Design a protein around this ligand. Structure first.
Ligand SMILES: OC[C@H]1O[C@@H](O[C@H]2[C@H](O)[C@@H](O)[C@H](O)O[C@@H]2CO)[C@H](O)[C@@H](O)[C@@H]1O
Ligand code: CA
Length: 769
């Protein structure tokens, strides 16, 4: 490997060999169908709300999130980079697709597949990833840096449906070598959203932008229709001319053929026919190819940038609503703007790289923090783009000031903004994109007094329940299969209108968002204040025995939605205490004296009774009435964790908090698989995992990272990082279970998982508070 020295890959990048087989991979541990797309994954490309494309470590464009809210894992084999090299003096050159695999059928059989093992590496530090190609049959070594401009405090470039592929080529040998790099792409209009005639009318055009010193050649792959529908739009690939390279192209090759129409040209001398052809296709799939060719002398390095854009302006959800995607604000809504997007990227990518370096640098340059922590911190952010992210710029046929936003809990449980989960998972938004965060919280504020008296069947018990109760915060803002933002509470496994954590978590999120954006946004507190008071007042009514604390009802009435709580729980009780203290402080800020007094009174009574009911001398009991009420719960003091972040002080005695955290580390971490897999949710006082429910026997990745932040704040530095390390190890390490770029909700002791591609582990960002 002589190419790594010519590029700048951070030491904390996650790494794997191109073509590497992984032997230890985990699988779903449930009986019902659950997504398992394998360990062949990579860091995604594409902005927030743009739809994303997962290009894997083997080189294939395979994990398709272009249909917003959906996950489709299938390799589109025409989409590749390929290389040609010929040493000066030799008769023939060699050509190779940079993909460690081959197609299933005979399409593209003429191409040179099966990029060999031990001939290159993949690296990822989101939003960047890299491939290096160090092949004994390729004398010129190549590397590519690929990224989308995902930039904190930037809501413009961060939305773009674009990727840049910055190539570096170096000749370490003593002979001149002719080199070509070719980008191929299938015209994917009709890949989704089209029931019949899926390729019909697709056509490719070549754009030559010859502005002085900024020459770009691109293919625009669209459809002759000017219809404005979810399926229609354009894809573009292209390249910027640099000194010493020539550009060639082929407008149209057939993807549902042997591919020799293209490959016979490329494999000969790395130069394409430059044949423009706008003839639309009928049944055949078609694609385009953009290539560069150059001669590298001994010791010479050259850099050349390619790009990919996709202008698919409309997202449709299963309930029938069509919305424009956020980036349409910047490029238009007609779906004929892919070149404009591509051109912006090709002309500004160096600026974007610097903007990304500028935001990563404070963390990467901190030599007190281990590399592994940096690996997890940055790579967990993949989910902000890859979580079915929806960000609207108007309903089709509709103008509002704000742009509604939603991130999925996951794909298996296809619910937008699940509030009990976002309590953990929204840290990156408040810390890095706070205008999005506050918009999402205003969305929740607006739902507080919505009433929907129509009934739904509760999955867990078959009982009928009211969809949405006035004064109760919703579980979620809908499903991509139905009507995001419009029909809330798509979740039906339990009835969230009786949950004991949602209303408290809502208040805690509101106050968090004020505190972590500098305690200046009084406007945000004013907007949400009525909903905060309502939320707490309603939850107070669920106190059955006048101890001042809502009563869990002997069912799963909170985020651990198969794990029953009864009476006063440590989890919901501590959240309640903290929410009361937050509301007191908001009351002070807004000069609502009567609110301050009321919530202070409730707080004092509840605090006294919580301590008396649950403090056992070593930790806080799980709850007051369950069969295993004395279980040690990893999340028992979630309210105090948030109180630390919100700077609300002690809600429970410091001595008791420290004892509880030490107990959790000693038991839930260190007695669970030697502390190498995170914190198991429930452990019995005898050091055996609690078997009352499956969720007690799971490590929750987002709970464990949040617990690590709690330990860190409380000075338990070694414990914090050791606790988090197990989650990193399972996700990323060779000894783990192969969950990179699909971190799950949970795993059991065998390492098998539930719900890959999950929002909650974004809570790792709570470690940066
Ligand atoms: O629906 C989300 C919810 O699913 C729970 O799993 C259920 C599943 O929905 C149901 O179809 C199947 O028959 O039973 C399982 C429970 O065993 C899951 O446990 C929840 O955590 C999740 O929120
Ligand atoms: Ca009570």
């Amino acid at each position: 490997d002589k190419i790594s020295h010519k590029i700048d890959i951070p030491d904390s990048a996650w790494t794997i060999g191109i073509g590497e087989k992984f032997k230890n991979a985990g699988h779903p541990n449930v009986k019902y169908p659950m997504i398992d797309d394998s360990y062949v994954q990579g860091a995604p490309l594409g902005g927030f709300g743009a739809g994303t494309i997962g290009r894997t470590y083997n080189g294939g464009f395979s994990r398709w999130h272009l249909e917003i809210g959906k996950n489709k894992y299938t390799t589109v084999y025409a989409n590749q980079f390929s290389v040609f090299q010929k040493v000066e003096g030799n008769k023939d050159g060699v050509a190779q697709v940079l993909y460690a695999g081959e197609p299933e059928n005979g399409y593209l059989s003429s191409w040179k597949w099966d990029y060999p093992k031990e001939s290159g590496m993949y690296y990822a530090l989101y939003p960047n990833s890299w491939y290096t190609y160090t092949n004994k049959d390729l004398p010129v070594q190549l590397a590519v840096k690929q990224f989308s401009p995902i930039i904190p405090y930037n809501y413009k470039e961060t939305s773009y449906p674009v990727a840049v592929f910055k190539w570096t080529a170096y000749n370490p040998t003593n002979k001149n070598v002719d080199v070509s790099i070719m980008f191929t792409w299938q015209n994917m209009i009709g890949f989704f959203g089209k029931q019949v005639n899926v390729n019909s009318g697709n056509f490719n055009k070549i754009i030559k932008d010859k502005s002085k010193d900024s020459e770009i050649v691109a293919a625009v792959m669209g459809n002759i229709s000017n219809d404005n529908e979810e399926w229609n739009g354009e894809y573009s690939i292209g390249v910027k001319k640099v000194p010493g390279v020539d550009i060639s192209y082929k407008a149209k090759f057939v993807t549902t053929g042997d591919g020799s129409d293209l490959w016979h040209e490329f494999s000969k001398n790395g130069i394409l026919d430059n044949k423009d052809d706008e003839t639309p296709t009928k049944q055949d799939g078609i694609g385009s190819a953009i290539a560069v060719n150059f001669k590298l002398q001994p010791g010479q390095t050259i850099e050349v940038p390619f790009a990919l854009s996709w202008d698919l302006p409309i997202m449709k959800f299963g309930g029938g609503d069509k919305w424009y995607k956020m980036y349409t604000k910047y490029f238009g809504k007609n779906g004929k703007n892919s070149f404009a997007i591509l051109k912006e990227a090709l002309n500004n990518y160096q600026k974007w790289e610097k903007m990304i370096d500028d935001w990563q640098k404070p963390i990467l340059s901190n030599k007190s923090k281990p590399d592994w922590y940096k690996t997890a911190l940055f790579n967990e952010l993949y989910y902000l783009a890859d979580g079915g992210t929806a960000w609207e710029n108007g309903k089709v046929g509709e103008k509002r000031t704000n742009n509604m936003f939603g991130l999925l809990a996951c794909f298996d449980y296809n619910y937008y903004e699940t509030l009990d989960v976002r309590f953990y998972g929204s840290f990156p938004l408040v810390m890095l994109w706070p205008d999005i965060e506050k918009q999402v919280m205003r969305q929740f504020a607006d739902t507080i007094n919505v009433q929907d008296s129509s009934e739904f069947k509760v999955g867990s018990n078959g009982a009928m329940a009211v969809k949405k109760v006035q004064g109760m915060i919703p579980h979620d803002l809908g499903s991509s299969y139905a009507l995001p933002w419009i029909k809330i509470n798509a979740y039906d496994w339990q009835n969230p209108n009786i949950w004991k954590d949602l209303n408290s978590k809502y208040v805690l999120l509101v106050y968090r968002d004020y505190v972590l954006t500098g305690k200046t946004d009084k406007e945000f507190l004013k907007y949400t204040w009525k909903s905060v008071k309502t939320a707490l007042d309603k939850l107070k009514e669920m106190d059955k025995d006048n101890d001042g604390i809502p009563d869990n009802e002997g069912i799963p009435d909170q985020t651990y939605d198969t794990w029953s709580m009864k009476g006063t729980s440590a989890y919901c009780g501590s959240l309640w205490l903290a929410a009361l203290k937050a509301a007191q402080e908001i009351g002070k800020v807004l000069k609502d004296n009567e609110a301050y007094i009321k919530y202070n009174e409730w707080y004092k009574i509840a605090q006294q009774n919580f301590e008396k009911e649950l403090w056992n001398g070593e930790y806080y009991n799980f709850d007051t009435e369950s069969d295993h009420k004395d279980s040690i719960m990893a999340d028992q003091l979630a309210g105090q964790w948030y109180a630390d972040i919100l700077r609300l002080g002690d809600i429970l005695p410091k001595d008791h908090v420290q004892k509880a955290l030490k107990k959790i580390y000693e038991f839930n971490v260190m007695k669970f698989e030697n502390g190498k897999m995170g914190a198991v949710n429930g452990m019995r006082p005898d050091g055996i995992v609690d078997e009352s429910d499956i969720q007690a026997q799971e490590v929750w990745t987002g709970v464990t990272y949040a617990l690590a932040s709690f330990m860190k704040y409380r000075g338990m530095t070694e414990e914090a990082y050791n606790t988090a390390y197990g989650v990193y190890k399972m996700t990323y390490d060779k000894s783990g279970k192969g969950y990179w770029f699909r971190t799950p909700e949970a795993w059991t002791k065998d390492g098998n998982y539930r719900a890959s591609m999950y929002m909650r582990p974004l809570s790792i960002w709570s470690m940066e508070v």
